[PDB]
Ligand binder design. Structure first.
Ligand SMILES: [Ca+2]
Ligand SMILES: [Ca+2]
Length: 313
């Protein structure tokens, strides 16, 4: 018996193929990605800015490297600069400027191995970027994904520019989040393994240093799919989009089974993001390829881009 709530969901915008990676930059502007946009059967994913007032869409970037289009899927906003870090299933990790210019971060990791296509990412408060990589090698390699075979990896892009594969053998690692102690120190890394209906955790000992891999939680349902994107609220409750279940699961700090479920007026929630300093959660979903918003019980946990480099406390 798990309590379920049915809050009012308000449509923001639609017609965004594979709507994913909702994020707010330092100016408060809202962005999302459309990974499934295609031109002539070839990838032509886009990064869009959405006007929250009218809901009008503006494509600011259509990533492409050497004639190979991208499949942008997840985002995080930087702190020291107002730029976006985008996980791309075809191009790896991208840094995108608000004027639409972009740069591909790496073609190979620290060990010289070819970079894998990424899906989502999360910054810890020290500025390290944790990334899931469910795809195979980046372009120009043939596109493939670990939906059946276990070749999905996890990366950590350190503050000193190193791209380190921290673990592998995942069956489609998807959403990812970092739990911090009250003193702001990175404590645990939570990784969603979609098809297996599992949420995994690691203890963070330092930059690109994780240990004690554990099955942290279980996603409900026997439907095809499972945990996609996720984020923490200010009380460290973890909200997880359960693709294919019509619900967003709410886990307590200790994980295990959901302590609560949120019913959505659609079947495929993909990701979510809190509007800075509010209880408003923006949700992307793949049933109607649209963006919606609803009010949670409390404010979200501050993202890295909201913290101060030169603060006192
Ligand atoms: Ca995802
Ligand atoms: Ca998010």
């Amino acid at each position: 018996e798990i309590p379920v709530i049915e809050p009012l969901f308000t449509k923001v915008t639609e017609d965004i193929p594979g709507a994913e990676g909702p994020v707010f930059d330092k100016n408060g502007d809202f962005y999302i990605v459309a990974p499934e946009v295609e031109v002539n059967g070839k990838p032509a994913g886009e990064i869009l800015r959405i006007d929250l007032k009218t809901g009008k869409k503006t494509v600011i970037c259509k990533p492409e490297v050497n004639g190979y289009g991208g499949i942008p899927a997840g985002c995080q906003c930087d702190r020291d600069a107002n730029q976006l870090f985008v996980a791309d299933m075809r191009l790896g990790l991208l840094v995108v400027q608000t004027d639409g210019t972009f740069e591909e971060i790496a073609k190979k990791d620290s060990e010289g191995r070819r970079m894998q296509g990424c899906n989502d990412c999360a910054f810890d408060y020290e500025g390290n970027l944790w990334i899931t990589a469910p795809a195979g090698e980046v372009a120009p390699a043939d596109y493939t994904r670990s939906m059946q075979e276990k070749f999905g990896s996890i990366y950590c892009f350190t503050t000193d520019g190193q791209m380190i594969q921290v673990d592998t053998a995942f069956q489609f690692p998807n959403g990812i989040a970092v739990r911090h102690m009250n003193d702001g120190r990175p404590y645990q890394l939570i990784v969603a393994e979609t098809p297996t209906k599992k949420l995994w955790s690691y203890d963070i000992k330092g930059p690109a240093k994780i240990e004690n891999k554990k099955v942290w939680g279980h996603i409900p349902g026997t439907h095809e799919g499972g945990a996609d994107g996720m984020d923490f609220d200010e009380d460290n409750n973890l909200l997880v989009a359960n693709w294919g279940s019509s619900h967003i699961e709410v886990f307590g700090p200790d994980g295990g089974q959901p302590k609560m479920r949120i019913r959505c007026p659609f079947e495929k929630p993909s990701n979510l993001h809190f509007k800075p300093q509010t209880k408003t959660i923006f949700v992307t979903e793949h049933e109607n390829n649209a963006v919606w918003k609803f009010e949670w019980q409390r404010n979200g946990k501050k993202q890295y881009c909201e913290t101060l480099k030169f603060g006192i406390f």
